[PDB]
């Protein structure tokens, strides 16, 4: 019959994009396994919420039959812009006509939606892919301290830091020159009451002198905030130890010195911080043209970009929707031609998304930016 009849697909990485790719193939009768580094699905995913947009992220969920399950676990949320003094400068609340536009979902809820939709044993846990080798017809996959597997098609979906890209591209991940510190506060109504009342059930964003603060007061009962700034030149080839909360507190309280005490309370009561340099996997010249066997990349492994334009997962789920339709629609003469068609479209929307990310990033970290239009 079709391109993948009597063939199996290996997806590397069980993030939202890989699991979506698995669902869209599996529901067309395709033999697909997902190899995920993580030991069990009972592991907290650290991060904020994700919003699926109409026409991209939501299309993927709709084609999968999971769009209602997403709406049931997602939460529409307004945005408040505030100054460093705790003045609300602007309050965009959720008009009921727009409540389906991009409601926020917890990363563990999205993962659980996608896992429950797959056949038992679709995802193989504790499988860290370390290397690929193409045979005559099949790839051999090598995992850390676990037996090898084979596949006719490999889809790299294992995130922005993937080390298994080289059969697709020699493109290297780059630092953009911004740095992000993320943290969670449990029971924020009790533990950061001032900042919680400032948020007032809305997301909050504030900018003063090249420091940006973002918060969501309701990621499944926890408040999630991030502080972003131009990487201090001091930290060329980090003078802050992120395992030492006292060191991060001391750095942040100096940087936030002229901010209202409701923001400094955030910094003071945070049990642990996570620091990460902003990185991009730049889409430039095309990828390797003549690969030994069929292989491609979707999600952050394809187009990792700064998280400043609300884009990221949406272009990933668009990757999964286009590749899965190309592999299953009957229109292509080979797996290679289905892949080429996916990559050619992804290079267009992906270059646009990356350009918008990089532009927002340049603008937002002028030493004199405020969210004010
Ligand atoms: C601080 C911050 C904040 C945001 C965002 C990023 C960052 C850094 N993003 C971007 C968004 O998080 C991102 O686009 C998606 O997580 C990408 O999904 P993927 O499944 O491609 O990768 P993701 O990285 O989520 O998943 C990769 C998976 O592969 C696994 N893995 C890694 N190496 C492996 C190996 N060798 N073998 C097997 N498994 C392996 C990992 O364990 C993980 O499960 C975002 N986006 C958005 O739309 N809205 C937002 O608000 C934000 N906010
Ligand atoms: C420019 N800022 C205001 C922005 C814009 C958009 N959307 C757009 O620009 C798209 N606008 C169109 C639809 C094209 C008209 C955005 O979509 C976003 C954001 C902000 C980011 C902030 C992210 C932040 N990061 C740096 C880690 C963060 O910590 C939080 C948080 N703790 O709540 C975020 O909210 C953040 O992850 C995020 O999701 C942002 C946006 O979604």
Resolution of this PDB entry, in A?
Answer: 2.2
How many angstroms is it from 81 CA to the middle of ligand 2?
12
Ligand nearest to the backbone CA of 218: 2
62/361 Cα distance (integer angstroms): 32
Q: For residue 317, what are its two tokens?
A: 């789920």
Distance CA 326, CA 30 (A): 13
**What determination technique applies here?**
X-ray
| Residues within 6 Å of ligand 2 by CB | 48, 180, 182, 203, 205, 214-216, 224-226, 228, 307-310, 360
Residue identified by tokens 């997806």 is: 11
CB count within 10 Å of CB 350 equals 22
Q: Determine which helix (DSSP H) or strand (DSSP E) holds 335, and give its type and residue range.
A: helix 335-364
Query: Comparing C-alpha atoms, which of 105, 120, 51, 89 is closest to residue 317?
Result: 51
CB 23 within 8 A of CB 123: no
Planar angle of CA 93, 94, 100, nearest 5 degrees: 160
Site to substitute for ligand 1 among 162, 313, 316, 323, most atoms within 8 A of C-beta? 313
- Kindly give the number of the ligand 2 atom that is closest to the alpha carbon of 226: 29
Ligand 1, closest atom to CA 314?
Answer: 48
Query: Which atom belonging to ligand 2 lies closest to the Cα atom of 224?
Result: 32
Q: Whose CA is nearest to atom 45 of ligand 1?
A: 312
CB hemisphere CA count around 314 (13 angstroms)? 22
Q: 38 labelled as ligand-binding?
A: no
């Amino acid at each position: 019959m079709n391109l993948l009849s009597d063939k199996n697909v290996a997806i590397i990485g069980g993030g939202p994009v890989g699991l979506t790719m698995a669902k869209l193939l599996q529901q067309n009768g395709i033999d697909v396994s997902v190899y995920e580094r993580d030991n069990d699905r009972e592991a907290r995913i650290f991060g904020g919420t994700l919003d699926l947009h109409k026409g991209s992220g939501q299309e993927a969920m709709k084609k999968a039959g999971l769009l209602q399950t997403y709406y049931d676990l997602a939460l529409p949320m307004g945005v408040n812009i505030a100054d460093e003094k705790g003045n609300i400068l602007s309050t965009k609340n959720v008009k009921p006509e727009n409540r389906f536009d991009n409601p926020e979902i917890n990363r563990n809820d999205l993962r659980a939606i996608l896992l429950n939709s797959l056949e038992n044993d679709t995802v193989i846990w504790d499988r860290k892919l370390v290397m690929l080798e193409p045979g005559k017809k099949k790839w051999t996959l090598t995992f850390e301290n676990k037996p090898s597997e084979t596949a006719d098609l490999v889809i790299i979906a294992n995130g922005g830091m993937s080390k298994v890209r080289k059969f697709v591209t020699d493109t290297e991940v780059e630092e953009t020159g911004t740095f992000n510190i993320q943290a969670d506060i449990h029971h924020p109504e009790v533990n950061c009451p001032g900042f919680f009342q400032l948020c007032n059930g809305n997301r909050l964003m504030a900018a003063h002198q090249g420091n940006l603060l973002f918060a969501n007061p309701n990621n499944n009962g926890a408040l999630h905030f991030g502080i972003s700034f131009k990487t201090p030149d001091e930290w060329k080839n980090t003078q802050v130890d992120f395992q030492n909360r006292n060191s991060v507190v001391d750095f942040l309280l100096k940087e936030f010195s002229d901010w209202d005490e409701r923001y400094k309370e955030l910094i003071r009561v945070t049990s642990s911080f996570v620091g990460l340099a902003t990185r991009i996997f730049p889409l430039g010249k095309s990828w390797k043209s003549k690969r030994p066997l069929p292989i491609t990349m979707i999600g952050d492994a394809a187009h990792l970009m700064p998280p400043f334009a609300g884009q990221g997962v949406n272009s990933g789920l668009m990757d999964a929707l286009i590749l899965s339709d190309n592999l299953t629609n009957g229109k292509f003469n080979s797996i290679e031609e289905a892949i080429e068609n996916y990559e050619q479209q992804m290079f267009i929307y992906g270059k646009e998304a990356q350009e918008e990310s990089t532009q927002n990033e340049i603008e937002m970290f002028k030493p004199d930016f405020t969210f004010q239009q």
